[PDB]
Design a protein around this ligand. Structure first.
Ligand code: BI6
Ligand code: ZN
Length: 96
């Protein structure tokens, strides 16, 4: 179950630097900057990633798909998400 509290499930991955580093060998076309910025880091197996905060896992990405958009699509309850895009952003992802 994703995290809903305000405590990062993976503290060691709270820095864009820490995270971005995991995409060192990334062979996929999904933009690793956006992924890291959206709060994800690579698990080194396939195109699987997780949110350092809510700890939600995402995989099987399509070319055009947007990290922030996805992160909100599947894990709305995430706080790190809430803090960067705000409730309004989220609500309109699900209502529309
Ligand atoms: C096309 N588009 C992509 C765009 C990101 C996509 O929609 N992928 C998801 C599609 C699949 C199924 C539903 C969903 C539900 C959320 C995850 C789940 O499947 N994540 C897994 C997982 C595995 C076992 C138990 C729980 C979750 C996961 C785990 C760790 C790292 C990466 C992925 N989900 C996805 O990743
Ligand atoms: Zn999250």
């Amino acid at each position: 179950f994703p995290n809903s509290t305000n405590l990062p499930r993976n503290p060691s991955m709270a820095d864009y630097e820490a995270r971005i580093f995991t995409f060192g060998t990334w062979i996929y076309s999904v933009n690793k900057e956006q992924l890291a910025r959206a709060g994800f880091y690579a698990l080194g197996e396939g195109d699987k990633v997780k949110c350092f905060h809510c700890g939600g896992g995402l995989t099987d990405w399509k070319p055009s798909e947007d990290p922030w958009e996805q992160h909100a699509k599947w894990y709305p309850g995430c706080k790190y998400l809430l803090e960067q895009k705000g409730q309004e952003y989220i609500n309109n992802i699900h209502l529309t």
